[PDB]
Design a protein around this ligand. Structure first.
Ligand SMILES: Nc1nc2c(ncn2[C@@H]2O[C@@H]3COP(=O)(O)O[C@H]4[C@@H](O)[C@H](n5cnc6c(=O)[nH]c(N)nc65)O[C@@H]4COP(=O)(O)O[C@H]3[C@H]2O)c(=O)[nH]1
Ligand SMILES: Nc1nc2c(ncn2[C@@H]2O[C@@H]3COP(=O)(O)O[C@H]4[C@@H](O)[C@H](n5cnc6c(=O)[nH]c(N)nc65)O[C@@H]4COP(=O)(O)O[C@H]3[C@H]2O)c(=O)[nH]1
Ligand SMILES: [Cl-]
Length: 242
């Protein structure tokens, strides 16, 4: 019944995911740090996204990925509940996984792998049913699923960007703007539907998007083109939550 609903969501949402943020971890009661075991080898990584029967994990390069290859691309992971507890009660049993895919990328002169891992036995049903509900909301595009990061003294310190200064380009002209908020999928900027390019100085990152709201200086809401978002931007937002 619950099992059946989870099987239906598995089929419906094959290939889809929910990116992690503070509010998602809170809802799911799932810590974002996770231990992988490959025989007696062990390493901690961070969850990037979760799906109905798989999840994506970030590790440093030259750690888990070669270790998995030596073990026929099988390992086990331990999900923990969203607390600092060291009690047995905070942990789910280790679950068997198999590596489906991996990519390589850079951050701050350090190299990382993003690993897609499939559960070889049922994920905890309490988590699976909530991931399916989040995927229903993502499909609908009727309400927000993630928090937006408001740009202020505290968040600018945590984000790996230097300031609130950015640029908006549209109709062959580039204007200054101030970033007011950021999220995985867009931004609100202030300055003085249309296609545009949002950019800011970084290690200039350019993101193509479309206007969604304007209101009066002018506050402009932007939806980044969903299939084109630079991995470096996505990881900047993920880093903020981690
Ligand atoms: N198309 C589009 N327009 C957007 C989007 N984000 C903001 N806006 C526009 O900007 C207005 C201000 O949004 P806010 O200051 O975040 O203030 C919002 C926010 O606090 C809240 N709100 C509305 N929808 C949601 C939602 O799905 N989730 C959450 N958490 N808050 C929401 O209600 C307030 C007023 O909402 P509105 O009267 O609708 O007024 C919204 C709406 O016209 C977006 O993703 N898409
Ligand atoms: N940081 C930031 N991102 C922005 C802003 N405006 C749009 N976006 C981004 O653009 C995505 C798609 O906007 P939508 O197509 O209007 O699709 C929106 C819209 O239909 C609705 N929605 C969300 N918030 C509001 C709101 O305040 N008011 C209204 N009327 N609808 C909202 O829910 C859908 C999904 O919202 P999200 O998952 O947040 O996904 C939003 C968000 O990632 C902005 O002011 N700041
Ligand atoms: Cl997502």
């Amino acid at each position: 019944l619950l099992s059946r609903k989870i099987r239906d969501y598995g089929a419906k949402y094959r290939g889809k995911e929910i990116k992690m943020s503070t509010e998602i971890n809170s809802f799911l009661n799932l810590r974002n740090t996770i231990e992988m075991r490959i025989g007696s080898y062990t390493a901690f990584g961070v969850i990037y996204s979760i799906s109905m029967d798989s999840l994506k994990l970030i590790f440093q390069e030259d750690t888990v990925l070669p270790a998995l290859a030596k073990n026929k691309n099988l390992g086990s992971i331990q999900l923990k509940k969203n607390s600092d507890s060291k009690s047995s009660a905070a942990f789910f049993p280790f679950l068997s996984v198999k590596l489906l895919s991996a990519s390589a990328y850079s951050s701050l002169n350090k190299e990382y792998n993003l690993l897609t891992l499939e559960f070889l036995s049922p994920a905890p049903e309490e988590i699976a049913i909530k991931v399916g509900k989040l995927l229903d909301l993502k499909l609908g595009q009727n309400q927000r699923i993630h928090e937006r990061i408001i740009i202020d003294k505290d968040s600018i310190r945590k984000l790996k960007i230097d300031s609130d200064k950015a640029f908006i380009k549209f109709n062959g002209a580039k204007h200054k703007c101030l970033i007011k908020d950021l999220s995985y999928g867009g931004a609100l900027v202030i300055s003085s539907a249309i296609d545009l390019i949002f950019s800011f100085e970084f290690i200039e990152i350019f993101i193509e998007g479309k206007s969604k709201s304007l209101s009066v200086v002018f506050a402009l809401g932007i939806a980044f083109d969903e299939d084109k978002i630079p991995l470096e931007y996505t990881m900047l937002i993920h880093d903020y939550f981690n």
